[PDB]
Paper text:
Another fructokinase, FRK (EC 2.7.1.4), belongs to pfkB family of sugar kinase, catalyzes the phosphorylation of D-fructose to D-fructose-6-phosphate (F6P). V. cholerae FRK (VcFRK), encoded by cscK gene was predicted to have fructokinase activity according to KEGG pathway. Each monomer of VcFRK exhibits the typical ribokinase like fold consisting of a αβα three-layer sandwich domain and a lid domain. The flexible lid domain, which extends from the central β-sheet core, is formed by two pairs of antiparallel β-strands β2-β3 and β6-β7 and their connecting loops.
Numbering used by the authors:
A (entry chain A), B (entry chain A): 14 to 323
Amino acid sequence: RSDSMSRVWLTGDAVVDLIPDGQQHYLKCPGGAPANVAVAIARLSGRSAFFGRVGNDPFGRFMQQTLTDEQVDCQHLHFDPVHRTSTVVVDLDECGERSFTFMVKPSADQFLQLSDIPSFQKGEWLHVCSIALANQPSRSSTFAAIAQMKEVGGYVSFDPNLREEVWSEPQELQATVMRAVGLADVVKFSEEELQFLTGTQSIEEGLQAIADFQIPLVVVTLGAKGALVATPNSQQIVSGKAVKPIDCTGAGDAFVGGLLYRLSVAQDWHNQATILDAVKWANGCGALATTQKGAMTALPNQAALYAFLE
Amino acid sequence: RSDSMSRVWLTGDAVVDLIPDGQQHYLKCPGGAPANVAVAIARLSGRSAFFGRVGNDPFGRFMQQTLTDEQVDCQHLHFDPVHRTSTVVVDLDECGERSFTFMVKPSADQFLQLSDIPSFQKGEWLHVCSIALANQPSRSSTFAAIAQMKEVGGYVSFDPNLREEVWSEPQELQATVMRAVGLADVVKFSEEELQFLTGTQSIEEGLQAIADFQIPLVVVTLGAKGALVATPNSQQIVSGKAVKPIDCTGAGDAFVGGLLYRLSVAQDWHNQATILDAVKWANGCGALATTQKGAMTALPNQAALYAFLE
Ligand SMILES: Nc1ncnc2c1ncn2[C@@H]1O[C@H](COP(=O)(O)OP(=O)(O)O)[C@@H](O)[C@H]1O
Ligand SMILES: Nc1ncnc2c1ncn2[C@@H]1O[C@H](COP(=O)(O)OP(=O)(O)O)[C@@H](O)[C@H]1O
Ligand SMILES: OC[C@H]1O[C@](O)(CO)[C@@H](O)[C@@H]1O
Ligand SMILES: OC[C@H]1O[C@](O)(CO)[C@@H](O)[C@@H]1O
Ligand SMILES: [Ca+2]
Ligand SMILES: [Ca+2]
Ligand SMILES: [K+]
Ligand SMILES: [K+]
C-alpha cells in the first residue's frame, strides 16, 4: 500500500527564552512548548503545522522565522496588533516550572480567537499545553479547537506543562486542566504534575484517580528512569540511555515531539508495539534535547537519534 | 557659609534594556530614563533618590540592586505584587525613540499610586519623563507629585523623552505632555521632540510657541552641536567636544544628569553663569555616556568628566 504521514497541529505559545550565557548576557533562544514540539516533529521529518498568535514585534517575527526555517507550516500563525510576544527568563539552577519567569502577561497567544483555528481533517493530530488554557479568550478558543478536532475524527494530545504564574486566576488551573485531560487521546505528565493535579502522593494513586477518564494513552515521565506507559489495564516502564543534562529546558517537549512524530506516521497508533516504540523515540529525544542550551537547539534529526538509540 | 547639596527626586520607569552584543546574545543592561538620571547624579557625587514601582520579579530586584549599588536612595522604590518590570529591546541601528521596543505594557511603573509619593521639602528637585504620564494611575499620580513639589517650594524638571508605543491612547500624548511642560521649571527637549510637540518646523518656531509658558529654563539638545539654552528673552548655543558614539543609549539622560547635578549644588540655580556651566557639564556627560554599551555604563564620575572637559 502507501504510507500515511498525518499532519500534527500545534497551538499555543511561541516564546523567546532568555537563557543566561556568560551572564551579564542572555542567549536569545526560540521556545514555547508547542513551538518546541512542532520543531521536534519537523526535525524528525514529520508534518507539523502551528496555529496561534504572536505579537506584531521583533520577537514574534523571530519566532515566525524560526518555525518557517524549521519547516513548520506557519500559514495559521497570526500577529496580534496590540499584544506582545511572550518573553521568558530562564533560571539555570532550576528545571521545569520553577525555572521560568514570564515577563509578558497576558502575551499575544492568550488572545487566540475562534477565527484563528484552521479547518481540521480526519486522522490529524492536535497537541496543546495548559498555558493555552490559562486565560480568556485563548482558553475558550482552545477548548473549541479540541472539540472540533474530536468531531472530525482527529486525535488530541495534551501535555499540562504547568506554569501557574501565567494564570490570572490560578485557583482555576486544576479544574481547567483536568477538563482538558478528559478530552485527550494522549496525555503526558511529569511525576509531579500527575500527583499535583489529582491530589495524590504516588504515581500509582494518580493513575487510579484518572482511570475513570478512559484515556487511551497516558505517559508519565520519570526523568532519567524513562517513562511509565499507561494504556487500558496495563502499565509498563520504558527506560532509555541516561545522560548528564547541560540544559534541561525543553526536554519534556522533545519527548512529546518524538512520541507524536512516531504516532503520526503509524498505521495504527493504538497498537501497543507502536506505542512502546514511540516512547523509545521520545526518551531518546528528551535526553538529546538537554545537550545544548535552548529548548530547540538539540532537537535531533533521525540520523542523530538512531545513532543515540544505537 | 556652608554648601547646600539639594536632594533630587527621580520617579518613573526603571527598566532592563536588552542590548544586542554578539547577538544571538543580549547584554542585560540596567536602564529606564529616570533611573539613568538618578545614577548619573549619584556618580557625580550628588544626592539622588528614586520613588516609583518595579515588578516583584528578578528584573525588578536587579534594578533595586543597581540603584542601591550606585548610591541612589531607594527607600521609596516599591515592588508591585502583580505587574512586571519594564523590559526593553534595543535596536543598535537606531537612536532615541526609534531604537526601543517595549515588551511589557503596562509595566509596574504605570501603576504608581498616590501612596508611593514621598514627603517633599523646600528646595528639592523632582525630575520626570513622559512614560510616567502614559497611562493611569501613574499619570494622575505623577501630576499630583508635581503639584506637591511646586506647593512645598521645590523645583520641577521635565524631559518628555517620548516613547509613543507605551501609551494605550497615543492620541493623548501631545496634550498630556504639554500639560507637564506647563508645570516645569526646567524642560529638556531634543530638536525633534520640541518641533513635534509644538507642531512647528524649526527650533526657533518651537521656542516662540512655548514662550507663553514662561518656563525659567528650556534646553534643546542638538546632538554633536551641543545644546541651545533658552532663558527668558535669551538664547545661546553651548557646544562641547564631539565624540563618535559607540552606543547612543542613555546620552540624553546623562545630559540631564549632569545638568541637574550642577543645578542641585548651586547657591542659585537661576544664575545665568550657573546654568551655562551646568550645560557644559551636561554636554560632557552626554558625550561620555555614548562610549560604552548600556545607558548607565559610561556615566562619568567627576574625575573622568573634568579630564574630558580638559
Ligand atoms: N538525565 C536524563 N537522562 C536521560 N533522559 C532524560 C534525562 N532528563 C530528562 N530526560 C528525558 O527527557 C524526558 C523528560 O524528562 P523530565 O525530567 O521528566 O521532563 P518534564 O518534567 O518536563 O516532563 C524524560 O522522560 C526522559 O525521557
Ligand atoms: N556625537 C556626539 N558628540 C558629542 N556629544 C554628543 C553626541 N551625541 C550626543 N551627545 C551629547 O549628548 C546629548 C544628547 O544628545 P542627543 O542626540 O540630542 O540625545 P537626545 O535626543 O536623547 O536628547 C547632546 O546634547 C550632546 O550634549
Ligand atoms: O517546556 C518548555 C517551554 O515551556 C515554556 O516555559 C512556556 O511555553 C517555555 O519558556 C519553554 O520553552
Ligand atoms: O532614555 C533612555 C531610556 O529610555 C527608555 O527607553 C525608557 O525609559 C529606556 O529603555 C532607556 O534606558
Ligand atoms: Ca514539561
Ligand atoms: Ca531622550
Ligand atoms: K536544552
Ligand atoms: K551608552
